[PDB]
Design a protein around this ligand. Sequence first.
Ligand SMILES: [Mg+2]
Ligand SMILES: [Mg+2]
Ligand SMILES: [Mg+2]
Ligand SMILES: [Mg+2]
Ligand SMILES: [Mg+2]
Ligand SMILES: [Mg+2]
Ligand SMILES: [Mg+2]
Ligand SMILES: [Mg+2]
Ligand SMILES: [Mg+2]
Ligand SMILES: [Mg+2]
Ligand SMILES: [Mg+2]
Ligand SMILES: [Mg+2]
Ligand SMILES: [Mg+2]
Ligand SMILES: [Mg+2]
Ligand SMILES: [Mg+2]
Ligand SMILES: [Mg+2]
Ligand SMILES: [Mg+2]
Ligand SMILES: [Mg+2]
Ligand SMILES: [Mg+2]
Ligand SMILES: [Mg+2]
Ligand SMILES: [Mg+2]
Ligand SMILES: [Mg+2]
Ligand SMILES: [Mg+2]
Ligand SMILES: [Zn+2]
Ligand SMILES: [Zn+2]
Lengths: 79, 57, 55, 124, 72, 97
Amino acid sequence: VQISKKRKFVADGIFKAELNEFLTRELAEDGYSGVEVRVTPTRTEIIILATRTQNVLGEKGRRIRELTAVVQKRFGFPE
Amino acid sequence: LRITTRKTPCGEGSKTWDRFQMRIHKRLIDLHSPSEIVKQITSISIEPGVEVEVTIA
Amino acid sequence: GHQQLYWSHPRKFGQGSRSCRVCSNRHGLIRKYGLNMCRQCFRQYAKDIGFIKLD
Amino acid sequence: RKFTYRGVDLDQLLDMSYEQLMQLYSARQRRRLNRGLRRKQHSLLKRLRKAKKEAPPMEKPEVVKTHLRDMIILPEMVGSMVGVYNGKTFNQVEIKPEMIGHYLGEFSITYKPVKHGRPGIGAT
Amino acid sequence: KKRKKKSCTTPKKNKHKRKKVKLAVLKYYKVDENGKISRLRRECPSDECGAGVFMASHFDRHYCGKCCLTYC
Amino acid sequence: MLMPKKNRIAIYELLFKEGVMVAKKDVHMPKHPELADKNVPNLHVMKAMQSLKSRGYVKEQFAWRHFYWYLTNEGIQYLRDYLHLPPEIVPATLRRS
RNA sequence: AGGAGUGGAGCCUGCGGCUUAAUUUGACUCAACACGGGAAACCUCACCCGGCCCGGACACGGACAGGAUUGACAGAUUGAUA
RNA sequence: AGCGUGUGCCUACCCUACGCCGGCAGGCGCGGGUAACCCGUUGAACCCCAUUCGUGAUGGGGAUCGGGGAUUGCAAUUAUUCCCCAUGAACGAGGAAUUCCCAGUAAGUGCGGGUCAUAAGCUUGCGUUGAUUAAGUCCCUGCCCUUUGUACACACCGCCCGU
Ligand SMILES: [Mg+2]
Ligand SMILES: [Mg+2]
Ligand SMILES: [Mg+2]
Ligand SMILES: [Mg+2]
Ligand SMILES: [Mg+2]
Ligand SMILES: [Mg+2]
Ligand SMILES: [Mg+2]
Ligand SMILES: [Mg+2]
Ligand SMILES: [Mg+2]
Ligand SMILES: [Mg+2]
Ligand SMILES: [Mg+2]
Ligand SMILES: [Mg+2]
Ligand SMILES: [Mg+2]
Ligand SMILES: [Mg+2]
Ligand SMILES: [Mg+2]
Ligand SMILES: [Mg+2]
Ligand SMILES: [Mg+2]
Ligand SMILES: [Mg+2]
Ligand SMILES: [Mg+2]
Ligand SMILES: [Mg+2]
Ligand SMILES: [Mg+2]
Ligand SMILES: [Mg+2]
Ligand SMILES: [Mg+2]
Ligand SMILES: [Zn+2]
Ligand SMILES: [Zn+2]
């Protein structure tokens, strides 16, 4: 089945709030500024705004490749 | 949607209330056309904050 | 044995079966629209959720 | 003079099954029996029966202690010594035939009756 | 408020200490001079406890410790 | 903490395969969602990851109710030596796909 | 200038007292007292009575495949099939 | 009439039309709704029109108790809640004192939301009926300014004198 629009919008807001809190705690050291979630039926893109992107990406892109993993693990939507 | 809560984290002081409010707006459009043209026009429509649902009755 | 006794008491309804999704507190819980937050956490995260004060 | 529960004496009550006893009881006891008894109540009944079987012909059975304050007094319990927990101590109760249909917790009081003293300074 | 101690109960409830048995494998088998082996302890009829899982020779019962199966 | 060796093997295999671990901090959860058909309680995962963290093998973060764990290089070496994995095996994180 | 009142009655709920094994606790003029979103049968629970569990990471030492340790049928025991 | 809610990650617990059974609380079936779609044209209560009663603690009031029935729950006793017979207390407008209010307002009357397995004498909102009085003042209470006096500055809950 499906849920009502009220619950859907509330769930989207709660998801964005939790994502922002997690990103804050993770990337405070890197000057984390904000998060922007653009939802597309193909893929859901997440833009991370921070002062420096070198630390967020990590070496060879390891660290960011970790984050997009745990997010997929946390909220459960498919790989 | 409305949520009325108390401002104070505890139970001390004047009884003051916060009234939070969320508004949801909804539009409907009808089209007599084949699927392909609808997807053609819809592809551009992607906008941040707007949920678009296409159904064939 | 201990395996049967531990956590045996049913928790399918009541205050003991519900808690805040942020701080795990069972008091002052908001269940409307499936928020499942205590009032303090909700007041902290209302702007992020999308609730605006107009009056 | 002879005891009768809603026109039925003790012997017929002992002969009756649970379904027959449901119609004699009140609404709450009937609903409780219809929902059924769990393992702990059956264990208590078994212990009471075991204790009553081993009693001397002229002596009372050994006291059986329990925390089950919501147990319904069945006609098979008449004549048994039950210690009922009140949160602090086990109070000894002998089941009488006029207790049929009540709970065990109704016969072990959970508080001390109040005897008032002189009111303090904070009373006006 | 400050916590009161009130430390007085049954003197000491002791924890069960498991018995130390030296070479418990040996007593399961008996040996003749010819070199034969006879299994003193019965073997449980369960699936998992079929070959090496022996039972318990209690004074009035047989008990498998791995699946709680009991026989007279 | 006492637990069967196969639970530890499964947890370590999953951690080395993915490179990260997520838990909900629920000691009464009957089984970990990710570790299904292996019957691993969530408490075992929590305690195993805590033991790994105390030795520096994993890095930990906590968010809103959840534990997040990332694998360290020394943790990679420890898991590779523990599971007897060939030196040609790396977690999916270390592959820039 | 007035209206509806409260203070009087019965009852419902909070706060003092007094009892209790415990009757958990914060707050005391406005700016404490149907307030802590506090309408508690269990949970909530923070109080009292009694009984299990370790969910005491990690480092060092001891002991250990001639076994470190784990669980458990019956009878006893227990409020209890801890 | 109006504001709103409705099948839920964990999480078990939704709103209900229609048919039958029961006197009632309720029980059986069988459908709709993830909602301007179904409950729902939300047949609300006060109010309106008739009937009975007739200044009698009265057919006002409904406290306290007895006996039965049913629902929620793992569990209802120290009565969870609900229904039916029976019982029928103070109370005849309230001392000193004291609260809120200037128009769709005060008051009367119901209905939603929160709490909620069971659930409103509380709160937060919504309608419906709908006024008397006033368009002023500094008398009471309190708070601001200006002038003025001070031996106060931890600021009158101050400082300070003599037995
Ligand atoms: Mg009145
Ligand atoms: Mg009055
Ligand atoms: Mg009064
Ligand atoms: Mg008072
Ligand atoms: Mg306390
Ligand atoms: Mg003021
Ligand atoms: Mg209170
Ligand atoms: Mg209650
Ligand atoms: Mg009880
Ligand atoms: Mg209990
Ligand atoms: Mg309690
Ligand atoms: Mg241990
Ligand atoms: Mg009368
Ligand atoms: Mg009368
Ligand atoms: Mg009765
Ligand atoms: Mg009591
Ligand atoms: Mg009546
Ligand atoms: Mg209301
Ligand atoms: Mg309600
Ligand atoms: Mg309240
Ligand atoms: Mg004045
Ligand atoms: Mg002067
Ligand atoms: Mg001066
Ligand atoms: Zn919270
Ligand atoms: Zn066996």
